[model samples]
Target chain A: SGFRKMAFPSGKVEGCMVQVTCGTTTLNGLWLDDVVYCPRHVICTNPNYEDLLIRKSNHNFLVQAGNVQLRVIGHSMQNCVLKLKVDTANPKTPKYKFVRIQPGQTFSVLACYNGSPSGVYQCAMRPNFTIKGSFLNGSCGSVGFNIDYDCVSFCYMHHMELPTGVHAGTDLEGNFYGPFVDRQTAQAAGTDTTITVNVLAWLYAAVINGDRWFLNRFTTTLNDFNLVAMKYNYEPLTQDHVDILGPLSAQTGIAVLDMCASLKELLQNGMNGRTILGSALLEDEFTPFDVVRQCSGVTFQ
Target chain B: SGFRKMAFPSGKVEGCMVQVTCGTTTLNGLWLDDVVYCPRHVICTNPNYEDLLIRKSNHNFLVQAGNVQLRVIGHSMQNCVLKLKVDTANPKTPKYKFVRIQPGQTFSVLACYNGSPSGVYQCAMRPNFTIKGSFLNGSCGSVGFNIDYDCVSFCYMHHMELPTGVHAGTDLEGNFYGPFVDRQTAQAAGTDTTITVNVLAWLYAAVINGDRWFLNRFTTTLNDFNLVAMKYNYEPLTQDHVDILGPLSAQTGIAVLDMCASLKELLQNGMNGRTILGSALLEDEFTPFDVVRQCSGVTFQ
Candidate 1:
């Protein structure tokens, strides 16, 4: 019967020892003339001596010093990826060498470092990646460095259905009758009550009448108006004034003008654009202007 | 830190060969100058023409293997006695041996022999003192030699709990019973179904009770009764029968008379008194004379 045999590495130092490293991280140290098995090609060092020369034996030993960290990343053929970090601050460390685990093979990283006196010294893996994004704004943070760009984009797109004015009373009839077109009436009812619109009914009426100018005015006043003025502008306008005139008709026109500036800043900063639009469209309350007549000078009899 | 060191015996073989024998029984064969380890000693054999001389390194070896049938017996402490025998009829006569073991010690036997075409053969304890036995019965049939012995016997007692009866039962009064009363009863139970009194129990009781007459009768019956008759003598007698009549009544008196003849033969041969008593006592099923008379014999009132 044939017997199984094992191979050991050869090298020596008197009383001094050699430390192993992968990238800039140190793994473990061996005493003088001690045989060690490096399943993965790993680097060795003499921490006690500066500029110490060590011979390489058909193995890869990529070592570096000074705030050193190692990033071990694994990837599947389908692009699923994971990244881990290890810190080696102690010489008495476990043999944490990178093994070429085949596909479907499991692997782990070891972070070996010094611990408290008379305490257990162990190895651990460090966290590698982070992600942050805003759902309402269709905005994302800086991507790269192992961040999953595809996953973040997909998540943002999935949230787009949230802030459309279709359910927030921005339709033409809503502009004339809903609280968004008449703030005083909404205020009298209660600040907490919500305003809603039937946009489909408004669209049917606009299409049948062939009122192109009214349609354009309705879209611009409710949908395109900037958001900031509705929140910060405090001037109160009466129902008669808003009924005969649009939000930019006469008074508080400066508020709308200032709102345009805030919208530009928000767009640049990638904040919630839908929230800005919803507030601006709901600024006026009682005797609301006819969405068709406010911009095109077409009055409803 | 100190390192533990371990040493193993060298399993070496050389020219010629010494036939390993226990009395007339040749257990195994060892090559000239071969190192064979018995339980207590490392043995080296020297052959001088037709006679063979065996040397034991340990004093305990002599104690283990001293009794021989056809061969020379070694002069050792004789504390550990072993009986050896060899079969001569079969083409390959097996050798059988028995050893008296001591507590806290182990014994083992190995063999190396030749058949038609001479060949070098050897067998030893594997895994370092692996073949441990307090009491051992071994046989080597294919090689025409066998050896059996106790590895170790504590307090110099052979621990063979050989069954003395055919089966275990309970009496009418809920007393548990065994098949044979003694060695003789055990031998009788091997052949016959109904043994009268369990002569073995009676003899043992007599010995314990210091009844010389009972012992004398027990010894005589055991030596005289055939294997089948001996079994018929020691069947258990019920307490109800003894309550009416004294122990020496007709049934028990006849058993005692038969036992006298067996005891005489046993005494002449200097056989073990206990064995004789055991056989006779286990033979018959009858009440003791004293109990039978006290319970059954009555005057007219």
Candidate 2:
């Protein structure tokens, strides 16, 4: 069943974003409140979220059986609403698709092969439209529903169960968050010998609560902050290399070192690994190693 | 007519690599041996290399009266002697090929024409070959005679003339050399102020002396050795950047950085380097600078 305690003014959708400027100064409470996250769309019904629902909700990819556990668990953003859906690979599967889920629920089923069928299981949020006249039949955007469900099954494979709402996220369009309330653990400059609210344990706690983005945003913030404040190395890296070296592309030495390493690998490759397909294929203009050698241009440097 | 002094051996062909490990211990003296370097193949006979042979015995492509002045100079190989021949582009031509050369000799001719003809013109040691059971039939290796005349021409282009009885080479199947003798010029620890023998300034001396291998070996060593010891560098290179940061994938650093760079280059390449062959082709996997970007299994070292 769905639960509601507030009656707020209707929200407006500006451009592609839903606006909720007065939603809250902080969604720290949503940590235990009610909501789910929608990756590419806004999923809010008169302003509410759920993973699954049913109250005579005998129907739904929307309001009932599958509502997309959607919402920003920690911080929130402006002009936002949750959007979601579901799609499934079907057999003679009509109403079996009608299985439901609550905001913090999992609907597991060992699907059996049925030689029979009915209704539909919208695996989830994500497609179709009714825009007019590209000549309703010509080829404009052929194959429109290809990207509908990107991370359905594998998204949670890491086995790291995010808490119901240990933390949240903010974005102009997605799982948005407003101002943030820093936890004592993350906020403290405590030493190695210190006890700071068991921050990490709590962070994982947040994950288990239903806020995957909580852990995501937290990990992200931690990485960025750590890099900016602590790391520095220039072993060797190109500016481009540094840009994506990820957690490893740090401050001082690694950047240049990484660059040198990339060049070296390519150098060896071009000089030695030129592959020509059969004697019939044309020879290559240059090999990867050859190009890098050219890049170095130096006999030994 | 073939002239040789040794009854050395018989041979069978192995692969392209003419082996000579047991050939000799010190033929280093062959450097300035009676030989001239020809880029293509032998272009000589009697005592010289030529572009075209002629005079009273003027001859050309075979199947005509005037035949190529072809055959090896001096000694012999496995089957025991130097044998070569010429084919012509035809017609009633004969007697204009009185070309002559001497080991360390220069064969010269100004073959006149009676529709052209053939005589004392023994062009150099390049050849025309035959295939039996393997080929069985067909007009297969037709232009064998074309190359037959190629080497004889360029063979004398940069001939620095070698001294007669300079040195020799022998290969089990071809020309092989074992160890080496250090030359005074190339090997002497002599004081820097002195100079030695004024090496021959005449030309492909050996081509004139029935020694075409001398010249062939000379030219090859120059090319292969020089490239190995000299060419090098980090020449200019094409680089690729993988876009998208999905898994352990860094969101802030990797995604934006990878995304920005990929966009820049693809934009550049899309606008320019996208070479597609009509509606009949799939886009090329290579964009000059894009690879490995697609190779990453999200493995960004």
Candidate 3:
């Protein structure tokens, strides 16, 4: 357990993010007051990033993202601790009512659920938050769930997973980067070769400047990056552009750095002939497709 | 009644739109085999316009526009006949069972529903499609209803009434003209002075060319026309532009002709201190606001 290694330096809270390497496997987890909930499937985690922690008394927290639902029944207790149960779908079987633990407790679980309960997850909070117990595969990970910081590619893929709700996301260094619309806009782009990273940045610039027309182009360009990451093998995305696009909006972007992040993951997965979703990637010449088909389908809100 | 004047002319079918000058009131009606359902509120109608006719066996035709629902229970009979009842909310009443008619018939009702049942309508199709019987004030008109021909302003206003549903509309002379997104896009623009007929046409062109970002600008420009009509008193919109925007898309057209249509109606209404909805208009300088405030409030479909 990495709870002893997690140092709360002044401003850090109970739900802050922490990452550690254990026996050649890098893990990311939430730093609790008493327990550090780390999982084995984390690729990377950003330090000083916040986690989406629900802390309400006698309340049911529910969020519907596509077919997956993150439901929690909990009450915030004294001393920054939470007497909570994740995915408590069946009220009759109140098993977790006896499973009380201090804030400084340490626990670990497998993040990736490969088969029936599908998706590549980053972490799991409970001892057993399996599929049949109302825990969805895509809920905690696959799309970078509670963690606030990640590489641009993770953020893009994370956004592509959501079928509804628009999100203004940030990059690994805690910089504002995107106004990811939704899946419908992403799918509308298809596998068109015209949507490059440069086009994406240009469209984002257009959108943030109040040109709403550019949103369609932005999503289309993003889909291109999702499908074929190494298409622009030699193009160097400038860091200066990323820094400029990052803080342009307090709540909302750079394009190529994100393009590079997506490409890095795609190229790694392409070598293995699989996608992050654990699906087979179709081969195209030497490189495998990052995302060929198998993507979920929206509302405009 | 103008039912006798409505000659079949071989190619024309039942449920065709027909117009006639009834005294000072130019009425538009649906050409049924036994009955011509004309209303006193029609301003103008095209010579050969098709009406939306619902004819099915033991089926319910339903369309939801905001709080209003256009519901009908009907069945298609032999000899191009329709045994139907409009807005038959309570099946227990079954009043229309005795209201059978041949393919050719004639009936007239007042299209305008003033106070309690709001909106200005073009025509009514029954002995009574009143609001009390699930007939909404806005179901038939306020915007042009089933009649297919109207000035550009009427079409624009018609589109504004719909909070949801994207419509590619046309003008009075049977010309394709617009891809009106919805009211959210329209309202997002507010009453800004920069949105003129030229800008409206330009945005439409951008949208039609598949530049989706232009949709926001398009709706914004359309809203300007809805709010005020005589901002451009000197600049004349050319017929070439109208003819060009028209027929650009099979379902969709021009901006200035629409501008003129809106301005003509606005000016006429301003002179009398009223809108087409019979609502009072607030004065700006020498003219009054076309649609100053009261408009009904969307889903994306």
Root-mean-square deviation (CA) per prediction: 44.0, 33.3, 25.0
- The native-contact fractions of the candidates, in order shown, are 0.00, 0.00, 0.00
Q: Best candidate, TM-score-wise?
A: 3
Ranking by lDDT: 3, 1, 2
CAPRI quality of model 3: incorrect
Global lDDT scores for all candidate models: 0.21, 0.17, 0.24
TM-scores for chain B, in order? 0.16, 0.13, 0.21
Q: Name the better of 1 and 3 by lDDT.
A: 3
Tens digit of per-residue lDDT, candidate 2, span A1-301: 0000101000000001111111111110110012222221122232233431211121222211112222222322223322222232212111111111211111111000110000000111101101111011011111100000111121110000012112222221322222322121232111111111111212222222222221111122323333422222111222332333322223222332332333233223331312111111111122222222222221110
For residue A86, what is the lDDT in candidate 3? 39
Question: Lowest summed-lDDT stretch of 10 residues in model 3 chain A?
Answer: A292-301
Could you give candidate 1's per-residue lDDT for residues A147-173 as a string of tens digits?
A: 011111100001011111111111111
The TM-score obtained by model 2 is 0.14
Candidate 3 lDDT, tens digit per residue, B58-107? 23322222224334333232211122233423221211111321111111
